[model samples]
Structures are given as structure tokens and as C-alpha cells.
Target: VSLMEKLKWKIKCIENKFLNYRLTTNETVVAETEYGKVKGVKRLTVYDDSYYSFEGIPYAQPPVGELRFKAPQRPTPWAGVRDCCNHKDKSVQVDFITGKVCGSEDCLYLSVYTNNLNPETKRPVLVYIHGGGFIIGENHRDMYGPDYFIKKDVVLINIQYRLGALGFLSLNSEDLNVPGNAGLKDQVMALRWIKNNCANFGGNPDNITVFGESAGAASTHYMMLTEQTRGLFHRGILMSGNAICPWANTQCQHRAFTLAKLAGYKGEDNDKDVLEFLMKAKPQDLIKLEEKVLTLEERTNKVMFPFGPTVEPYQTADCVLPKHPREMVKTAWGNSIPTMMGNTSYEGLFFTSILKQMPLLVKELETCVNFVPSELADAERTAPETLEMGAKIKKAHVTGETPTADNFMDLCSHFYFWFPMHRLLQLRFNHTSGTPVYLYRFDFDSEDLINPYRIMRSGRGVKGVSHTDELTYFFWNQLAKRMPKESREYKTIERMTGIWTQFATTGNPYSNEIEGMENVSWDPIEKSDEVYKCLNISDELKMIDVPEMGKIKQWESMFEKHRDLF
Candidate 1:
């Protein structure tokens, strides 16, 4: 109890602290990657063994200088210890519809998470590409944290690619040396990196699942078509997006041209010079020009410019003419990897609400039809019956007692989003005879949050879920912050996550006769063709087949009539 005894106890405490720090440091190890040897943070968590996380690793050389707008070149290996703790830079952000600056283009980095870097275990790899349409988002976005998947014994890699004009500006014929879709090509490079180097990180190079939502989902679809992406991944999870009809392709190309013109360079119709100039322009200047073009008001438009992908004939050199994705899917041009594709219940609501704000009238429907490109319009006209149905839907919405302006807007949503995605899914299912295909319509609602929008508050009151709402259940995020941690939502998360992880691990998502919880059954799209298992989000999961919902035969017939136009 004296001063000497107190001094001895304080020394012992300090010694104990030092020992603990040393033990923590000793447990960690570094591995050599394609980029270089970098250290990772070590942890002992819910997983049975130790885990390591290497963040912000460069998979390709920084897409700056002359390399800008060009395909991602291989990353040159570094000699010394490089820190991989921070996030890579994000691609430059252009205004949503109005040219406004938002983010930087120096954002071409990737992150990795693994458990016990032992080759024998050979864990499955899930490479996630983030979704923010084709513009605003980065891999650093917290929603894509890998801890969840790591806990489930999988190696998770999140990648960042170029966005907006910097990533997708198509070059005209004269500038054929430099190509377009650099952002997509960047992803292709990342997949190639994983295929070659994943084994060093205790991952099975053979069992990779490429998945994403929104633009990320679109990227997955593109990868399905690109010869560059063939065989890079064994399976895919496409959420809320797919490459479907002529309208989708035309819109994408139109956006590409608009972006080129905004950049202030005129070359051959598809020359790379315009994109090269923008890439070389000072970052601040580029941001300023983008802001000037894409204003907040413009962003809210149903059909915004500087969005969507492009068709580069030179890029697809083998084809006589640039092919639309629907044609490619019908011909099975891409790999027939088993796929799980679905859309949220209210896919149309995302843009329909924006359309409702526009000044539209029943008489303007023809004008609206004229606004669409000739090829796309012709394709829609091919199925006169479908167009009639669409017009009827528009007229009913516009002339009803509670008249609204969004009649044409709703039509645009179906034309641009719903029908196109539906057609694509049908074609994919039909083409992949042996490959397992799963189609889902996310019907859960967040009416309490979404009902404030007048268009969402009809008689039934937003019965189907809005686009990306299902992501709330899949990923615990700030948007739907109120989702309960231990509630049925969490149980739904467990079930859905199980299906996804199981799918990534093995080619099949379903485990044995039983899938996930007792009440929920995950059905393959190949079975019955008329039945689909509904993922009910209640205290207990429930599986029910909606006979009316799987009307693929009718939808396919309608699309078949329109094939030539597309």
C-alpha cells in the first residue's frame, strides 16, 4: 500500500499494454499482390479464423494523362511498401442532367477482404460493382462494406471505375485509335485481375460472382455482351437493370453524343478527340463545364442527357453494324453464365414521379412519341397492339377524374424501364436452356416514407416497392436507417444473403430441397415457367406463386412482333 508498491503496479500495467500491442501486430501478415506487396489490417471477429482487409488497391494504372479515356492499362507493379488503407479517388462527377460538377475522375482503385489467406481453403469471391446510374458513385461508398460477406466466409472485392463522360464518351471513326466505354473496360480489367491473382488472397479463381445494382447492374449486363468479359466470372446477380430493347440502346447512344457536344470538341461522329480533350482539360474546368450543362432542374427530367452507354462499331468490329443488346441476347452472343436478375416492385415509380412534375397533356402524347429516336419508335410501333395498350394506359391516367400530367411520363417509364427490362429477362431465360435463371419482382413497400409524393398516393397507395427500396433490406444503409436490426427485415436479409452467398459459393443459389427459412422457397425460373416464389417480408417468410404475374408467354409474343423494328 506504499509508494513503492504503487510504482511496481503502474510498471506492470505498462508492460501488459506493450505485450498486447506486440501480440496484435504479430498476428498480422502481408501478401504479395499483382500491384505489390502491401500490409492489411488483421482481425479476429465473428468468423471462425483470422481475417485481413486490403483497401484501395490499384488494379490498373491511374487513368490520368494520355491514358485518360483509353482502355485501362495494366497496373505497373510497385517496388516498395505502399499503403492500401484509404479509398481510391472517385471518377469525376458530371451534373445529373444539367452540366454540373460533382466528383473527380482520379477514382480507379479497388479494395479486398479475405479470411485466412490459405490456398487450400480457396474461398468463393464476390466482386461488387457499385450502382449510381452511370454517374455519381464510388467504391468507397459505405453501403458496399465487405464485412458482411467476409463474416459469411467469402472474399469480397469492391471496385471503382470511371463514370460519366470520362468513362463512356465514344470516339467517332477518325479517332478509332482511342476507344470509348473506358469505365466499362476498367471493370473488365478488374475482373481479369481477380481471375489471375485471386488465388494469392485465398480465393477460388474459378468461383467468382459479379453483381451490382442500377448502373452497376447495367455494367453486369454489358459484361454479358462484351467479348472482353467472357468467362471472367462464373455467375452474375443483376439487380434492377438489364439490357433489353431498342429504346434503351438509343437512349444510351443519345446521351453519349450529348456528352461529346458538351465537351466542346467536334470530330468524326464518334471520334475520341472530344473525349481526349475533356480528359486533358483541367479538372476544375471540366467540373465547371459539366455543372453548366447538367443543372438540378434538368436532373429531375424523366429523360436526362449525358446518361446511358454507347455503341461503338469499331469496338465491336466483327459486326457489320453496331448491334442492339436485344439482338445480342437473342443470338446468345455473350456467355451463357447462370444469372439471377430481378427488379424492384416500383421500378417505374423512380422516373414516373419525375414525369408527373412535367407539363404534359393527352394531346402531347404524339409529340412525346416523336421525341424518341426513329429506330426505337419504329420498334415500339411494330407491336401496334402493345403501343395501343400503352396509349390506353396513358389516356386512362390522363383523362380520369383525378387527372394527372404523368400519363405520358408513365408511358415513358414503361417504354424506357419496365417493358425493356421485361423483354430482356424473357429472352435471357429462353436462350439459356441449361443455365439456371431466377427472376424476381421485389414487391415490398416503404409507403410511410414514399407516400408524401402525390403520384404515389392513389387508392391502393404505392402497393409495390419503389426502385432500390429492396436494397435497404439487402444492405443496411443510411437511406432506410430505420430497418430493425433484429426484426423480420433482418431475417429477410439472412435469407436473401444466404441465397446470394450460396449462389456465389456454388453455381446454384438454392441449398438442398429447403432454401433459407421454412416458409420461403427459392424457385428456379426454368420450372413451370408460370410460377415464381414471392419473398414475403413478414415475421415468418412465406412463398406463394402468382399465376397472373408470370405472363411471359404473352409478353414474349408482343416483343416478337416488334423484333424487326428493334
Candidate 2:
């Protein structure tokens, strides 16, 4: 079906070339896609550069009714030009802000923003994937703006996929084989759509770069490992997350049964029975599984990811991940693509509010150390060996007997974010086919610069670059007001945006256009380096040995000592 869509689109492109297309109107812009023509609206960026915004373009058929729990299919073609002026519904999940069920199951859509619509232009393309722990996220401009990147003369795209149980519910049965990872497959469908139609929107289909933060970053990393995404993209950027993150992947078969039980299932305890029962489960019940399926220890440690990608039991054509991520990294197609990955100075500071809200959970942590991230070991949670290993981690990171938020913050930072990313960096250096792997630490901190994570999560006196702090510099966040042009905040935005845009345009991130670039190159990590060399982004930009190497070594030693327990 999709191959025919491609063929039809190619004929339309050639036919339209012979007959000139009035691609723009007084208030609207138009572009032809595989499905049909779409009407877009004109908008201006912060720098006053004009761009066209096309929102609510469906890339796949809605995963509803019989299509539920299956891989996405190519969108059915429309007869006339589709109105794409307004954003569509987001994926179904409990709203992070409202604590209520929001969005829809029919949510496999993507939006494109471009400065030019001429196919001859062939501008660089940056496709963004939003992150909300693979559960709650939005791709609308209000949350993820294209203003900064669009002004840099690149075509920008934001995509939305299925979330929660609607996204990831693994049930392999003889009667019906549902091998999960529908969310990740939704992203692949979106990428294929972009590959087939980006040229019509003035984008170089051959030069596409896929970048994301948090869970979206993990998805980007996963894309590199799977053969399903081959030839869909050329470059990648992972910010503050990777496939090895504790919350990135999970075993979800048990989770599916638990959800079915919660939905009042009274059938046999088997995959076929559980899946059939869940097929009719209310969307509201499906969103509640993250709360119902977790243990108290998991909640304390903030192990909120329950429905995410899983390793399929057997190989199939639709399988996105056939084996464990650690094994997949050594043989990823992404190794040949230029990559950039980094974390914030205080990636775990965003979780301080969790401890602050529940003082009892913090007390439990200081008492028995029962909240170790499950990614550390596959054994039973309360196994004596696992608890013993937990004690070692606590002693190394926690400062006082009665550990407070500040005293034990590094534990979360190390185990949840930094350590896994470091492991991937090491693996990439060893296995990559001469493609440069750029590494950086976003360390800038200022009260003047708006950090939504700090503002909402951290109280007064807590400091350092909180998770998502770098986003303000890279995007025009709706929650933040514009910074004064003369302030350091503005310069930081200019520098961050310049470096990212430079990377998207070329394989390297160094460019003289960046503020205070000083014609200095931000070099990538090489196997020959004695220590991991990283470009530190702060008030000053310079290269230095990774400061977190000591902590990373501590984790490596811990994992090595208990190798068999895994």
C-alpha cells in the first residue's frame, strides 16, 4: 500500500513540474503529499523570518478498533486538499499537568514547518521527537516551537505517536501476535512520510537529521539500532537520554496482564485471554496502568516508565527491537551516522520535587536503600544480593544518614541518566565506523534565563542546570518570555542554536557563526584519548576531560562486581 503511495506521489511531482504550482496564497501556502494537497499558514519567527506552518498532517491510519495494538499502516489517501491550519489531538495519556486523561488513541500525526516550499531549494531538515517518558508528550508548537531552527534556514518537523498502553502492550499469542512497540513504529511511519514528501517542502530528503530529548532521545537511539528505520534518516542527536536509561525500556507482558485484571477481566491467565479482554478496555483504564502496575519502591525511585519498547520473543518483519539494547548498540546502523549526545549538569534536579512532596519516600530511601533503579539487575527486587548492591550505591553517593534532596541527588543523576549515556559513548567509540561522536555537557545556569524545569520542580536555593534547561535556548517555549537581546540569556540561545544548526547542516557542530565561537572547533571523542574529552557548554565554551568520569567508574565497578546477578 505504501509503495503505491510513493509511486503515485512521484507521478504527481513530475506532473506538477510541467505545470507551475501556485504554492502560496495571500494567507496560506500549499504543498502536495502522498495522501493529497495540504494547506498551511504563514508565520514569523523571533528573528522575523517568514516560514510556513502545516499542522495536523496524518502520517498513518488511526490505530483504532481492529488496528489497535498493531504496527501503524500508511494513511489512506484523501480526495481533496486537507485543511492543516490547526493542530490535532495528541496521544492518549494522563496529562502531566492536569492529572486527567487527555488526547486520543487516533494520534499518529506530524507537523512540518519550513522557510521555503520550492523543491529546488533543498534546505537542511531537522525532524524533532518530543519526550515525556514515552507516556505523556505533545508535538504542538505551543510546547515544541520551530521558531529558532526555522530562522536558521532548515525545514523543521515535530511528530506525535501512541503513548501508554495504547502505544506499548506486548502480547504474543498463537491466536493473535501483538509484539508491542507500536509507538516506535509510529515514528518510523512518520519518518517514511517525511522521506517521501520532504522535497516538496524545500527539504533535502538525503540530509535529514532526527533529534529529540528525554524519551524522544531514547527513541532516536533506538532508531539507530533497528533495521526498520534504515534509510529513513542520515544524522542523529540525543539530548539527556539514551536506550540504556533505566526508564527507557521495560518488560511489559506482566504489565499487560495486570492492566487486564484492573479492567475487571475474569478470564484465563493467558496472553490470548488477557489481550482479548484488554481490547475492549476503556482508554481511561489503560492510562491508569502506570500507577496501578508499579510497586511502592518503583514510585519512590521515580521508575514511572511502564509502557515502553520491549524485546520481541521472536524475529518478525515488524519487529523494531529483536534483542537487548546493550547487544544492539555494538551493531547499530546509527554507528555510521554522525551523532551528538549530552546531558544537563543536574539532569536529576528535576526530580527533587518528587522527594520534596513525599518526605516519607525520602525517609525510606535513607533507611534501607530499597529504591534502586530496576535497570541495575534483573533479579527479584528484594533479593539479598540486590539489596546489598543497593547499600554500596547509597554509601558512595548519599552524604548523610538522613539524606535530603541535595544530599542524594547525584544517585538519580548517575544511575538514571549519566551512567547509561557514558556506556553508550564508550560502545560507540569502540564500534562506530569512523563517524565522529560529539559529546557535550550543558552547564549554563542563571536566574535570568527561564528554566521551566527549575521553576516548577526546584524550590529556592537549589541550582545548577536542571533537566530541559537547554531547551529554552534551543526553542521558543510558550511558557517563557523572550529574553533581552543584550542579556547573556540571549547570547546563550544564539550559541546553542548556532551549534545545533551547524551540526544539522554539516556533520560537525563547529561554526564561526556561533557567538564567541572564536573559530575553535568542538572536537568529537576518539578512541585514542586518555580520558573522555567533552565540549563543556556554559558561560564559556571549552574542551575538558569529562568531570563525571569518577562517578561513572564507580557505577562500572559496581556493575562489574555483581556481573552474574544481572
Candidate 3:
């Protein structure tokens, strides 16, 4: 070959920059933690060089055996350098949605990714809590890959906690033997770990933002509600979840006995017997019990997110949440930290995934996305207040119009997700004048992905932008890889990522005025203002008056009459 041919080949090699991303190695990155030094991996991004990822470092001791249902304890210190290169085992997990057992009992870990750990200017800290409604999820890259936020000037943290019975089996016990919210306690412990050791990874301990979506977002809000988290985090970004959402908490602990019965326990019908059987049973045994409790129909239908945080009786050291979340907000028990809260449109389509099987079972079973389940009609009728409120909810959603599958889906979006969360924002916004609330509605539609329902599909026309669709704009999703960096999707991703990091740096969601959103100055949701506004995010970002004014007005009047129903 001549010199001209060799030069042309060299040009081709120079332009193929993806080789850098594919060539990242694990041996070069290392960081010191409070317990010991650990080796991580080097990760390459599209635009720039590389970032460091310290994965699967423990923040607490494993909650096994006797510690099965207790609050998380601090991690036992290690001596030598630990390998933090790979994703750790997730918690004793069970995806109720898919029925996959993908975690271990001895799972309490966190991953940290940073742009530069040796810099003079410490970057902002962002800790993420993975969401599976406290029953499934992990701190791995496949779920929260560094591809999106690795470019931001901040430390990205992904944390794991115990799931299912191991995390949230409330036995109504009066001692530390059988309490709930071990998972939430694990998050608080992780936040404490970040506060003490984030500086070692070139992150500012004083400037930390705890953010998450779905169950993770509810956990972030719960962390704010817990008085113990006062000094750990200064800000939060809650997405697609609310601590006050009806689905976030369990109103009762009868499931302990229900599980105990199914697991074949042979002792007194009390908390002690339940704890003994559960602690001794294999993780799969408990998974079986959970399957027994939740039928495939209920699991797919979204009748409820059955197990979750509860209002613990004030009797133990780990009693994190005692007051109801609604009362907590009303009384201003929150730490009053600056918070950004938002939800996606069409959040109901996630619940009605299995509606086609039984047309007769549809209304009573539209689980995750509705105001109240019709199955609970008898119980609501028992209480005059709740019955009246329940009637109000049905009236508000339908308003004299016989509801069909399509419009009912729209009403659930507002009832189950958008308004319930917005209601909290309104309540929190009014309660605390010192800390501002930034609200948003994510309506970006990406044809790149949205796995449609294969089962009992109703409203054949339900555009399933469903819950967690907005996440594709922020994270490198596994379900879809159709969009390249040049697409409109990529542009939205950049804008949202920039806005999120900006919020982490400052309490405000906007800095330097978002480009197409300039006229709409983003403001908090407050009744004092004539037109309380929230940011509407998409390829075109705008701070507009609350979307769906009439629907919100319908629920607003109804909520006043039925505040106690949820």
C-alpha cells in the first residue's frame, strides 16, 4: 500500500471513538472509604475521557438471621483493599411484577461514580435509591448505568436494600424483634455513609441530594420525613413516587399472619411465631409464601403494592416513621429541605396491564393507577367518612359520565399519580415557606420503547407512556437503544440531565434560564400565588400552569371533602 492509502486508514481509526468506551478497564481506579481502600473500574463516556466507578461497597452490615426485620446496622469495617469492580448481590429480592428472584439476603451495598476524585473542587453528591416497591431492585449499572450522569460534575450513588418480607414485614411487635422499614433504614444508613466519606471520592458532604423514582422516590421523601436524616442530605429530587401516595404504605400488618399461615408455621399466632418461621425459612420459601398471598392476577393487575413502609408504633429504636405521612406533612415534620417533585403522564397504563382477561374484573382491579379499588367498597361503606369520600372519588373521576377503559385511564393518571403527588407538593408548599418546592410534569413521548401489554389488554388504544417512561430520558435504559446521540431523544436527555444536576448543585431546578422555557419562570406550587406553576419537561421545556386545569379542579373540591379517604 502507498502512503496515501495508509493515511486514509489512520483517519478512519481516529474517527471511530467508540473504541474508548468499549476499552474501559477495572484496574486503574481506586478510592479510600471510611472502612478501607477499594479498587473500582474506569468508565469511558461519549464526549470526554473517563470516569471512575466504585461498585458494590457495603454501607451496612448484612441483615441476616436475628437481624432479619430490624433497622440496618453500620457496616463492619474491613482491613485490606476490597474489590469494588463488579455489581454486588442485590437484596433478598423478588420481583412481584415478573416473579424473578434476583438478590441475596446478605445484600446492603452502594455504588459511586465520579468524574474526578482528586479535584480541588468537590462535586455535588447525588444518591439514587432503586425502585421495585421495596420488593425488588439493585445498585447495578444495568439498572442505573453511568452512561448518562457520568458526564455530569457530580458523584452518582446507587444503593440497594433488603426487599419483600426481609425489608417490610410489620408484625405489630413492640420490640426490635419484628419491625418494618428495614429497607428505608438501610437508605438512611447509606446517606450517613455518604456524609462521612463522600469527600474521599471528591464529593461535597455538605451538598448531597438524595433522589429516586417510584419506590425509590418515596424512600427519598420518607428519608426527609425521618427526623434522623436532618443533617445527612440538603436536597432531594422525587420522581414518579410520593411518600403520601396511597400505594407507598401499608395501613395494616395482617400480612404477617397471612404469610405465617402460608409458610406452615406451627406455633402461637403472634409476632414471635411469625418472626421465628420467617427468620428460619429459606428466601425461596418466603418467596413462595408471597406468591401464595399475591395471585398472578393481583400481581399483574396492580390490586395493590401490598408490602411497604408502615406507621410503626412508638416502641423501638428503629421506629423511623410514627405519624402518618399526611399528618407529617401537615404538621411540617419534614426537614424542610429544598425538594423537586414530579410525575409522568399516563402512569395508570402500568397497572391496567392485565385488564383484558376479565372485562367484569376490570373496574375493581385497575390497581396502581386509580383512586381506590372497588374491592374495598364494603370496607369503605363501613365508615361513613370513607364511604362518602369514596363516592366523591367515583363521582369526581366520572362526573355523571359512564366511564370506559380509555377515559378511565386518563382519570387514573391524575388520581393515582399526578394529583396525589401534586397534592403533596401543594401541602408541603404551603406548610413550609422557607424551603421551596419545584414541581414538574414529564410528557415526553419516545417511540423508541414502551413494551405493550401482552395479557388482558383493555382500551386497545391506551397509549402506554406508562410509569417510568420518563426514566429513559435520564438513564441508559436496557429496554431501548434505538435513539442515537443525534436524535431528539438525546437532546431531551441532555437538557433534563443538566437541569437535574443544576438542581443538585442549587436548590432551584433552573439556572441560567432553560432555553425554550425562558418565558415561563419555574415557580413552586402554592395556593398563595394566583397561578401556581410547575415545569413541564420534554424536548421543549416550559414552566406552565398546572396541566389539566379542569381535572385538577374536579379533584381539588373532592379532596377537600375527602381528605381522610387516602
Instruction: Give the clash count for each candidate.
Output: 21, 0, 2
Q: Least lDDT summed over 10 consecutive residues: which range in candidate 3?
A: 450-459
Best by lDDT: 2
TM-scores of all candidate predictions against the true structure: 0.76, 0.89, 0.86
Pairs of residues clashing in candidate 2: none
Q: Candidate 1 on 1-566: residue-level lDDT in tens? A: 12342354346446534532432333445777866787666643222334576767777877778776667778778897777645556677753322346456567778887766774667889888877766666764234545345556788888888876667655555345444567777888888888987887888888899888777787778877766666788888888776553322323443444444665657654434445556656765544554335445333332343534666546542221145676667645343787877765445556544443544433446433332324434543435554653444444334454434344444444545555565565566666657776655566554432211222222224455555666654542212223354555545556666677888877776654333355445665653454455444343445555322433333334334466543
Query: Considering every candidate listed, which one attains the maximal TM-score?
Result: 2
Q: After superposition, how far is residue 219 of candidate 2 from its true place, in Å?
A: 0.4
Write the candidate numbers in order of decreasing TM-score: 2, 3, 1
Candidate 3 lDDT, 1-566, residue by residue in tens: 12442353345334333443464764466677889988887876555547788888899888887788788888777888898876777776654333456578888898888877788798999988877777777765545666678767889888888887778877676753566777888888888898998998999988999989888998998988877777688898998888877668774476777777787878776777677777888876776567566545444334465567888755477667777787777644453788888877567666565444465544632222224433333332345544554565566555444556655666667755776675676677656757777888887776654321211122234455667777766765333353576787777777778888988998888766445556557766555664557787766777777666556655565446455543
Of candidates 2 and 1, the better by lDDT: 2
Which of the two, 1 or 3, has more lDDT? 3
lDDT of 2 by residue, 420-517 (tens): 88777777776777898898899988776453344346353667877887887877654545567788887888888788878888989887787777
Ranking by lDDT: 2, 3, 1
Candidate 1 regions with alpha-carbon error over 4 angstroms: 1-28, 43-51, 94-102, 174-176, 245-276, 287-304, 316-322, 330-335, 352-389, 392-413, 446-464, 476-485, 512-516, 527-540, 545-566
- Among all windows of 10 consecutive residues in model 1, the one with the lowest summed lDDT is 451-460
On a 0 to 1 TM-score scale, where does candidate 1 land against the true structure?
0.76
